Amino acid sequence: LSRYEKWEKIKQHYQHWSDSLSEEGRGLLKKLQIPIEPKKDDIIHSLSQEEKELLKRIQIDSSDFLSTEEKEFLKKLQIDIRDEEEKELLNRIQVDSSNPLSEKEKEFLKKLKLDIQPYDINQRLQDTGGLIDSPSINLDVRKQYKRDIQNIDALLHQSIGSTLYNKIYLYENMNINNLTATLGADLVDSTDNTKINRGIFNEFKKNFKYSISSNYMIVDINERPALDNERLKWRIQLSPDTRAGYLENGKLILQRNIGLEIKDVQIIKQSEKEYIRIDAKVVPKSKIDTKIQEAQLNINQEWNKALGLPKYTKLITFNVHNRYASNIVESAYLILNEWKNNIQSDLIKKVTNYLVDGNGRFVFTDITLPNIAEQYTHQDEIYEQVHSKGLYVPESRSILLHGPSKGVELRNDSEGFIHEFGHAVDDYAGYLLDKNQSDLVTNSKKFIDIFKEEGSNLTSYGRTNEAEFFAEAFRLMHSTDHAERLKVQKNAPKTFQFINDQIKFIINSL
Ligand SMILES: COc1cc(S(=O)(=O)N(CC(C)C)[C@@H](C(=O)NO)C(C)C)ccc1F
Numbered sequence: 001l002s003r004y005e006k007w008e009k010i011k012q013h014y015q016h017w018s019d020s021l022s023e024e025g026r027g028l029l030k031k032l033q034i035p036i037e038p039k040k041d042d043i044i045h046s047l048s049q050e051e052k053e054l055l056k057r058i059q060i061d062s063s064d065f066l067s068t069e070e071k072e073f074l075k076k077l078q079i080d081i082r083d084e085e086e087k088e089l090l091n092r093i094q095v096d097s098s099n100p101l102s103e104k105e106k107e108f109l110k111k112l113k114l115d116i117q118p119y120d121i122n123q124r125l126q127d128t129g130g131l132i133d134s135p136s137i138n139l140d141v142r143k144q145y146k147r148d149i150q151n152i153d154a155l156l157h158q159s160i161g162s163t164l165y166n167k168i169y170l171y172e173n174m175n176i177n178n179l180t181a182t183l184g185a186d187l188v189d190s191t192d193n194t195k196i197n198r199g200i201f202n203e204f205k206k207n208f209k210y211s212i213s214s215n216y217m218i219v220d221i222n223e224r225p226a227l228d229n230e231r232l233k234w235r236i237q238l239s240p241d242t243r244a245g246y247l248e249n250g251k252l253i254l255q256r257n258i259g260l261e262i263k264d265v266q267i268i269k270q271s272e273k274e275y276i277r278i279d280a281k282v283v284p285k286s287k288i289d290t291k292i293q294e295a296q297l298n299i300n301q302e303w304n305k306a307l308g309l310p311k312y313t314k315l316i317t318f319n320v321h322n323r324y325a326s327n328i329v330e331s332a333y334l335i336l337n338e339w340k341n342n343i344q345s346d347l348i349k350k351v352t353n354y355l356v357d358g359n360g361r362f363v364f365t366d367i368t369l370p371n372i373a374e375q376y377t378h379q380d381e382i383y384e385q386v387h388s389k390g391l392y393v394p395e396s397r398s399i400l401l402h403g404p405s406k407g408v409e410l411r412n413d414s415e416g417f418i419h420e421f422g423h424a425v426d427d428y429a430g431y432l433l434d435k436n437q438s439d440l441v442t443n444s445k446k447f448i449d450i451f452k453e454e455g456s457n458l459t460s461y462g463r464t465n466e467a468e469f470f471a472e473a474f475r476l477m478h479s480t481d482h483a484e485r486l487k488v489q490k491n492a493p494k495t496f497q498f499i500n501d502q503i504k505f506i507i508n509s510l
């Protein structure tokens, strides 16, 4: 099987297309491949002296609303500042405490996020799932992405054809964290790095049957040796009418919005290390979408019955547009099951009914949360939008859960959902206290001073504020691990009784 003949044959098939490219269209393809990173120098020049100094001393990863996408970069910025016992001094008490950011530190970083975004077409498409009109970036840039994307679509018009499509395989190397940051960290076996956890290999395979590409895949004509963190090795078979373009050095750029059916996931050995080989076939995206919608329509009927709700209530939403599609759907089943088992039937029903009254949702998605309507329609200011693994939005009565990302020191998605449901509990309890102006029961006189005492007893993150504290306590009060529930009763007895109070108070309301 000749790599170089294969390469030359595909290149010829697109030779006219390549020679027909304007240098405008040529640069557009380059810009897509190599995103335009922000220039660190112009940024710091714009900062004031208080802000230059404040930037020195701030310990970044404490933040919860950034992406390390966005966090990577700010520390790259922080050293360029520090240009003589500086390094040791400014980075001394790092491990000493994971203390919460000050409110003046928060507000600063919340606005510095708007100035550090790279112009990355493929990233914009993946983050928004193709819904590029999402108001999570500046309108001018938003319009700029649109013009570029529409132009690139126009460039990719030549299908691979009836002849070549079933003669060739195309390959993509991928980081496991790009699909699941949570599972990825420990899918590489801990005792040996060159081998795959078998129970955790089966993990990834039971629930992966279909995939979606909402951006432009850039695939290799011949398989390229895996880099460091590239443990996944895709082998793609195109469909006859799959539109693609030739990129230099033996690559293809595929059209956006295509569907992939998983045909075989295996463990393979390549050069004395284990890899996950993924065999996939290009199918129409609309085919995958119908399966997602059937799964959404289905799971709602299961849960409308099990919750005593109207038969056609829209409670659970599958906002799925990316490469780990089916597991997002599959995990949502698992999450709501753990949620049913660890929380009393009557608490679940009455709070969920409350959410329905406000047209709320359980949103399971692989697109970032600032691009979820249940958040951004109530958050006009981008500097107030939040990305995190999960969120509860009172204004929309909705729980949002982002599949791919990793949680701030938390075991599984199921525990995090319970935490979010704890927020909805706070909301309803505060509503029952005063139906006229509904506030959070954690914004009540009683709980506030409870927080100033028992607040720094539970999880490191529960120290953030009243609302978060209530939620972490609620979660731990409902853990499968019987040990965890007792610590809450012992290390924070007033919070324990307070929550249990509200639980009683909720259930006994008529
Ligand atoms: C590990 O799984 C999850 C992780 C999170 S989270 O992003 O880490 N998180 C706090 C966690 C600990 C609940 C969020 C939160 O307070 N929502 O109420 C903040 C980021 C705002 C959320 C849901 C999950 F399922």
Ligand SMILES: [Zn+2]
Binding pocket: 419, 423, 467, 468, 471
């Ligand atoms: Zn929270």
